[PDB]
Amino acid sequence: NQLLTQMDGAEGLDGVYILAATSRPDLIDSALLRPGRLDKSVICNIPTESERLDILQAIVNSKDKDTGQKKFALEKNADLKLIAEKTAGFSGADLQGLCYNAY
């Protein structure tokens, strides 16, 4: 009841933005979907092979994190970018783990 109040409908409205995450839409407040509340409910999809392409096209660049030496700066397979489309079933789970295995 405190959290359902302080930010909304009083001094406290002013300019604060709020960005949540959940495990479930069940165990969360019925005060969803009000303009005075958390409301937009942005979609996160099931990542396909196309999202595999997207993820590998990100993995291939630790972009400008120490521009003088990229993570995996020196690699084979300059041909066959998207080296791991085979992972299409992985759901993208923590591929930093596979990246550390590769390392």
Added chain:
Amino acid sequence: MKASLTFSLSGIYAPCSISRDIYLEYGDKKAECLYGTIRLPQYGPGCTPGKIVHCVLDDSLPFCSIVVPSKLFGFMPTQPTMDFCYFEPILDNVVPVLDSVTFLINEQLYSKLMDLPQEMQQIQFLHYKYNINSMETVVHSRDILTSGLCQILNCSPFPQGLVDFTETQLILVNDTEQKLSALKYANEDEEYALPKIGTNSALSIDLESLPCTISRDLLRPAPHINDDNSIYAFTDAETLLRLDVTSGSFITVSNMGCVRLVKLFVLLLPNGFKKRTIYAPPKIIASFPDCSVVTISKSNIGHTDIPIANQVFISRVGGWLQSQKCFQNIILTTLKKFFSESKRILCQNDLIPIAFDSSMADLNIAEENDESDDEDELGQYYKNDSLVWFFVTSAELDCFSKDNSHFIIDPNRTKLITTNITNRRPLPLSRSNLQRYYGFAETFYYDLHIFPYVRQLVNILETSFNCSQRGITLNASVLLHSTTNNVGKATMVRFASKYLGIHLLEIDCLSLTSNSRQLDSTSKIIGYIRAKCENVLPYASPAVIFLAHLDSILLDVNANQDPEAIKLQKSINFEMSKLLDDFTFKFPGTTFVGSVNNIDNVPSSFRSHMRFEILVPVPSEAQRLRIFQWYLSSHELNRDVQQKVPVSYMDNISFSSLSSYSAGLTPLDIKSIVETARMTATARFYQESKKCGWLPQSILITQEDLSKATSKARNEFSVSIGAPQIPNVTWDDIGGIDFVKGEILDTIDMPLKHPELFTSGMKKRSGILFYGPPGTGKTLMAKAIATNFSLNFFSVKGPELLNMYIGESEANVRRVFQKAREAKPCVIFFDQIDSVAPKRGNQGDSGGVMDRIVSQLLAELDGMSTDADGVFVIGATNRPDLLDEALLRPGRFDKLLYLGIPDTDTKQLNILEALTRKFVLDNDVKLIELAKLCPFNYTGADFYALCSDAMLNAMSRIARMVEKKVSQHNELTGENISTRRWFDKIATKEDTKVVVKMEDFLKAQEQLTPSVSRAELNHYEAVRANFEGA
């Protein structure tokens, strides 16, 4: 410009005349009907806003001479014609046409004109009867146009301007009440005779003190500067001839004792002061207590009877500022100046007032006099603010005797000699103002009809006086205290002192030269207190001692005491007790009048020996009326300000509106609001001055910004106590609540207003409880209450109360809830009571704190005996079954009002339009179309969501249009640009209203869905069907 004045026989509608010479110094052949402007010299604080006048050229008028109609001002040419005025030429004759004018007319001629069905016949009648012609004629807001007949009722918003029926509505009003029989302009009526009006040997008339200052430049005759000074008298009618000796003569008659010669003048023709009177400056009336009917006769004498009195032995009155080292020097120096700068007659048994600015103070000035020429300073800089009386006392007359009234002091043959002091009692204010004559710092005029505590204290002092004038000495004393700060404690004592003609000391304790300092000098401080007091009492008239902030020095025991803390405390109590009681025998009839800020904090001993008690409250609405009536008065604005352009209110101001909207504010806040309004209006004035412009004659206060300033006053209050502010939610920003607004007005408006006829019964409906599904405005109603009514808005946000330690309740809920009793009439808002007050029967483990909160909340809330201080508690809940038996219909919180899903047909429209307030839509897509296109079961705030995301897609449309237009720009000019330069070099104003045409509504209807489904509604509809157990 200076100009000479003359009054014509008057057509009223007939023009004034412009002289050829002014039509050469400001000659303009394109504008032969030169519209002049004149300032009329008058009695009063300053020259009232000048008149624009329509005029005809005349070559016959002597140099700078000008003529205006007499009866246009209600005066007649039988009365003394004033010979001068001031003139201003209107720049390029620039004048606005009036937006509206209203006229009042007698019912006979009103009906005779309204019998004509063709309005143009009345328009020609304006010409045939009144010779009015458009664009030629200028008209003025309230002027009576013929006695018993036509009058202008208002010009608006301007007081003056041009007229044309092509824009001027010419509103007419019927005098059904015949008040035009009384509202006749004629300031003179012919008397039945001049003989038999008394006898020239003896007239008797009430004297009065002239309500204003007057000065040598306004008078018609030409006295000298060095002699003839200071002393003058003013007369009203053919009375000037009943004395046989005209205006400009001396007379000397007095009701008792010695004669007192004075120069008598006719009043200037433009005078507002009541006739059948003889007016005088305070100087004369000061010698003549009561006896207001004065003996009058010719009493003339052949110039000055005595040319010398070779020494004079003057004496000062006792009184507060007349006995201090820091004033002594300025007192003597101003005395020397005053007596040196002019020659005067003086007499034993007479008083001389002296006035000076106490700001001059600890500035000596080294060289201006005695080693320097006689005329020395422009008092324009060497101002005045405070006033003193010197008694003329003995004088050394020659062989001549008895005719002492002519004693005079040659500056070389004579000297003035101090005799230390004398005792005399000042005038009663009821008969005469000093302050309003000298223009000093004001002392607000109470009236005992409507201020109960004033009636109290005035009666106490009145009896203390008169009982000891009779044989019975009274040791009367009183303490004033208040619950709030800043109520006018000192103002009351001062007012009473003047109203009764009683002397006072004015002392404040805060300015004592030491604190409650640890090393004992309570001796030093109480010694200085008595030693400063005593000095005047050996020659005091009946007087009071007023002590400001006794609470600063009468500290009270126990917080953590040093031994010296005990010694100081007891010493102070003892010495003060002795001092006061001793005074009661040291002098009779001399009254201690204290002031304090926390009556709990005054020590018990003093609290016992004190006599009377008076509690002065925050004022009522009935009192507020008179408060505004004072600080919005002409004199009470004009005093503060240099520029010759005066200020006024518009006569439209609703005193009801101020008095209601200013509820709960203290008098000091009312000053703040009015002076802020004055500022904002002057800022508007100088904004107007940026162009050649219009209305230059005077700024007026107006109802809009005077209303606005209340909001700032309330916020500056709130930042002192109760920091939260609230965003505005005006009444129309909600709708579709008709029954609910009904009951809320039946609870917070009608029982609160009109207690003159509402019985104000011995108990009252305590509050309002809103219950139902979320998103039905039940929060919004509270912000609306906070916006529109004058009520303050304290609140706690749900479980803002509960806190870590055991004993939660005193840590919050007690302090806040009593703070609402401590505040002026104010709501407490609650939300989520179903979280704050669990039903006690659902007992909880782990300390059961819910029982502690609920018990303290009920105890502080309910019963409310002797406690109907407007503490409305109002609030919202989700599901009322979880409320405690706190809800059980004792009327402690139980005004249940439901809110729910609207009626299908048009209340959704009322919702959409209300949320469309200050929204914009500008096509044939009427809101009916939207309200029909939306399907039902969408409800409440979900329609605000529908507008919200429609607006979002509308701004998205505008954003992508901007993206296109900026791309097409960057392709052609400004090849390296992005943002700030772009926006600062575009100048859109057609697009910037960014109105949605349509389509955003349709895709909102596609994208939105009801936020609570019927399967969710059923869970609320169950508790709805409980009807809280019915």
